[PDB]
Design a protein around this ligand. Structure first.
Ligand SMILES: [Cl-]
Lengths: 108, 107, 110
């Protein structure tokens, strides 16, 4: 069975290489998991900052409009001065944006 | 003896390797779905921020129309404020839409 | 023990197939990595564009406030007309946003 014993040694070597490949593959998956978590964290933190900025901007523009409305009183009002543009607003989407950020942060 | 026993150990080693491959294929499966979920939530968040910033720009510009009107009798916005009068807001809504569309795409 | 030659034959087949599965898997992981990089790149570019828009909107709104401040002086000032809301501002978070974008782009060198 001299032929057989040679093949068995070959198969053992081949198996050893396969095990090492599988081990490397698991390290690569671990690393990819780490990267995905890291990107999610960085996305979440950025969206949180932009959400703060856009909410503060909306509030500040609305206060700017209150002043403008006051000023346009003697002129007959904002709608008479600007036309229908007067009724254009800024929808508050803070809750909707916070909702997506919360789902992103689930993977931290 | 020796040869039947070596085959026995090889067979169980192959079983375990096949199981590990099956487990790795599931792990990669779940990773594909987690990456797609991230991309989808990113795109949805960006779409909302697109809407908010676009509306903010429009609203601010309408405020400026009112301000230009009111400053007319004082010599106009540029005379009153100086060169800051010319500072604008670049409309980047198409640029942002295009990025969102890229994130949403597969294949 | 002619069965032995044949158990061996089946083991050699199985190994061949396992090798192909491994090649295929390394490819799938490579595709996942590239996909992850693509998303990072797209995220960073979208965030940069929103950084620009939000920065300009803050600047433009503050200028609108300067005009308003001028206009309200003769009614005794913005704070008199608006009340304490006059002091509400827009925090400049551009450095903070830019740092986070930079970290996304920075990861694209490893
Ligand atoms: Cl404004």
């Amino acid at each position: 069975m001299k032929q057989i014993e040679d093949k068995i040694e070959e198969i053992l070597s081949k198996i050893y290489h396969i095990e090492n490949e599988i081990a490397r593959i698991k390290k690569l998956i671990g690393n990819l998991v780490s990267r995905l978590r890291r990107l999610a964290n960085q996305t979440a933190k950025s969206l949180e900052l932009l959400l703060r900025v856009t909410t503060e901007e909306r509030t500040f523009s609305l206060i700017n409009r209150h002043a403008i409305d006051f000023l346009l009183t003697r002129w007959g009002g904002t709608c008479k001065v600007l036309g229908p543009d007067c009724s254009i607003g800024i929808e508050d989407l803070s809750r909707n944006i916070s909702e997506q950020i919360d789902q992103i942060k689930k993977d931290e």
